[PDB]
Design a protein around this ligand. Structure first.
Ligand SMILES: O[C@H]1[C@H](O)[C@@H](O)[C@H](O)[C@@H](O)[C@H]1O
Length: 296
């Protein structure tokens, strides 16, 4: 499209953006541990809970990237897990919400990151990858194209970001290095590069700095369409009391929203965050979406 007013529409913000823009260049908000919104048991919350509303609320709020952690069970299905604890949500449940959303708003698309969160249940017939690829990925909403995925080829489909090994079906983003608790950079495809800031378990100070620092690198490298930037603003720690990802999120979100507001960047990258809601006055997900003004 041509009007900027279109980015203020959360359910369809990707509509005004050109069909030829690679998904890498787009500033896409996302959610960290997307399926933890059903954890309503106090002690489970202060540790696991990273969202308070459902996938659809999340999507109607501009979120187009979901952090999906699963696990194989006896019934040979894949469900959502937060470490060793079962979130009362399943993979099918995600894929259906994404479909209803996607049919109501065909101009959009969604990136689903899948990571094998826990070890498979003893009575599983197949491995994790094979089960996901033979029982789910074979579904047509999943885009089976690889390479520097353009927006045009992805509208209506579900782009996959692989955080599991042993894949056999071609499609979406190929699995890559991803070391533990740091910011790194690797190659994804022949034509692609990834800079990830994933410092979970770090002090607030270092966390805030890592976000802005990685954010500064993208603002500058803005016109490099073949280079993804994933920027997790989430920081989980030994919560228990006001130290839970909610407390941190109540500071880290407004903080980073404004930082983007004043800097008026032309690119912010893929900002994966916790607690997406409408409480934190400045709104991170909205600022990240707005920084796409430069593509229209
Ligand atoms: O607990 C962490 C955290 O949630 C990171 O953001 C995630 O990417 C890591 O894989 C996980 O071990």
């Amino acid at each position: 499209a041509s009007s900027v007013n279109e980015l203020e529409n959360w359910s369809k913000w990707m509509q005004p953006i050109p069909d030829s823009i690679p998904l890498a260049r787009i500033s896409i908000p996302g959610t960290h541990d997307s399926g933890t919104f059903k954890l309503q048991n106090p002690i489970k919350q202060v540790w696991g809970m990273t969202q308070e509303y459902d996938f659809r609320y999340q999507m109607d709020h501009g979120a187009r990237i979901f952090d999906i952690r699963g696990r194989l069970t006896d019934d040979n299905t894949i469900v959502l897990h937060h470490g060793p604890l079962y979130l009362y949500v399943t993979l099918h449940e995600f894929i259906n919400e994404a479909k209803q959303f996607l049919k109501d708003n065909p101009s959009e698309t969604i990136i689903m990151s899948l990571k094998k969160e826990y070890e498979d249940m003893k009575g599983a017939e197949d491995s994790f990858s094979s089960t996901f690829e033979k029982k789910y990925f074979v579904d047509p909403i999943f885009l089976k194209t690889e390479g520097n995925i353009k927006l045009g080829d992805a509208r209506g489909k579900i782009v996959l970001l692989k955080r599991y090994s042993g894949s056999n079906e071609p499609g979406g983003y190929n699995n890559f290095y991803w070391p533990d608790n740091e910011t790194f950079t690797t190659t994804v495809n022949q034509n692609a590069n990834v800079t990830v800031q994933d410092k979970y378990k770090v002090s607030y100070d270092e966390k805030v700095k890592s976000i802005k620092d990685t954010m500064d690198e993208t603002m500058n490298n803005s016109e490099d369409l073949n280079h993804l930037y994933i920027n997790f603003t989430s920081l989980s720690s030994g919560g228990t009391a006001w130290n839970s990802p909610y407390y941190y999120a109540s500071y880290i979100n407004p903080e980073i929203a404004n930082y983007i507001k004043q800097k008026n960047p032309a690119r912010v990258g893929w900002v994966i965050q916790d607690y997406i809601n409408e409480k934190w006055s400045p709104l991170l997900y909205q600022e990240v979406i707005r920084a796409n003004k430069s593509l229209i």
